[PDB]
């Protein structure tokens, strides 16, 4: 997060850290959607252009964290992947279309004040809140610069209109993506940055007071570049795949 602010304690309890066992480094963000399921970007696990192809035995899920680097004893919970699922049609070759994976944890995790899952939108929720001008919130331990937080950062950002998104890049934007960020004019900054991918884009419902994850941090070009925006996976468009792997 570039131009974000320090998260308050317990502000994002669904916020999960994706951590490399060896060498021990942060890979990406992710979110907790249940007690055994974690939602992240597929590009966090698999990206052939960069020889990246992480396995289940390769990583650790750390939930309940505030601090980037300390091991928060008695607060945070570290778990093991029982299995990883990438969307059969994730497009790494062209545009990172369908950048979404599900992780099944080796054991259910218990909820505390620091650990609590986020809701997944239902069709009418996505309809009323996934609108241009409406702000969503991203959190992450990623670069604060186009360098590292000591604590979880937040930034609130507006969703931008499809046309403006399409005209700011050369990449082919699909119906499974939405972009978010301020216009150079609005002259407000903030953006995800390296380290932040796979974390959640979330909105609070004005009807029932809940937090809904609407996007996943996917791709962008630079951090907090003018006229460029963040691309996020459209979680409701992929909802039916998500239910599929969870019941099956």
């Amino acid at each position: 997060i570039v131009e974000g602010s320090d998260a308050e304690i317990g502000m994002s309890p669904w916020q999960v850290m994706l951590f490399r066992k060896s060498p021990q480094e942060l890979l990406c963000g992710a979110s907790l959607i249940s007690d055994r399921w974690v939602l992240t970007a597929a590009h966090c696990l698999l990206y052939p252009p960069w020889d990246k192809n992480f396995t289940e035995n390769d990583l650790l899920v750390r939930i309940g964290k505030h601090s980037r680097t300390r091991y928060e004893r008695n607060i945070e919970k570290i778990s093991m992947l029982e299995k990883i699922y990438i969307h059969p049609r994730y497009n790494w070759r062209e545009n990172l279309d369908r950048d979404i994976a599900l992780m099944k944890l080796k054991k259910p995790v218990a909820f505390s004040d620091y650990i609590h899952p986020v809701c997944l939108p239902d069709r009418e929720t996505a309809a009323s809140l996934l609108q241009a001008g409406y702000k969503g919130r991203v959190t992450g331990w990623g670069n604060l610069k186009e360098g590292q937080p000591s604590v979880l950062q937040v930034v609130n950002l507006p969703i931008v209109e499809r046309p403006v998104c399409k005209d700011s890049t050369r990449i082919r934007i699909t119906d499974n993506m939405f972009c978010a960020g301020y216009k150079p004019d609005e002259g407000k900054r903030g953006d995800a940055c390296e380290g932040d991918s796979g974390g959640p884009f979330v909105m609070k419902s004005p009807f029932n007071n809940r937090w809904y994850q609407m996007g996943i941090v996917s791709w962008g070009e630079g951090c907090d570049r003018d006229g460029k925006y963040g691309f996020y996976t459209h979680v409701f468009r992929l909802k039916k795949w998500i239910q599929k792997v969870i019941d099956q």
Binding site: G10, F111, D113, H116, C119, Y134, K135, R210, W211
Partner: peptide, 26 residues
């Protein structure tokens, strides 16, 4: 139980920037 925070929503306490989100949903 989804989306209601143990420390905020459940104690009827607001975080310090949520109002920025709610005010935008017109």
């Amino acid at each position: 139980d989804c989306g209601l925070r143990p420390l905020f929503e459940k104690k009827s306490l607001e975080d310090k920037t949520e109002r920025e989100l709610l005010e935008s949903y017109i």
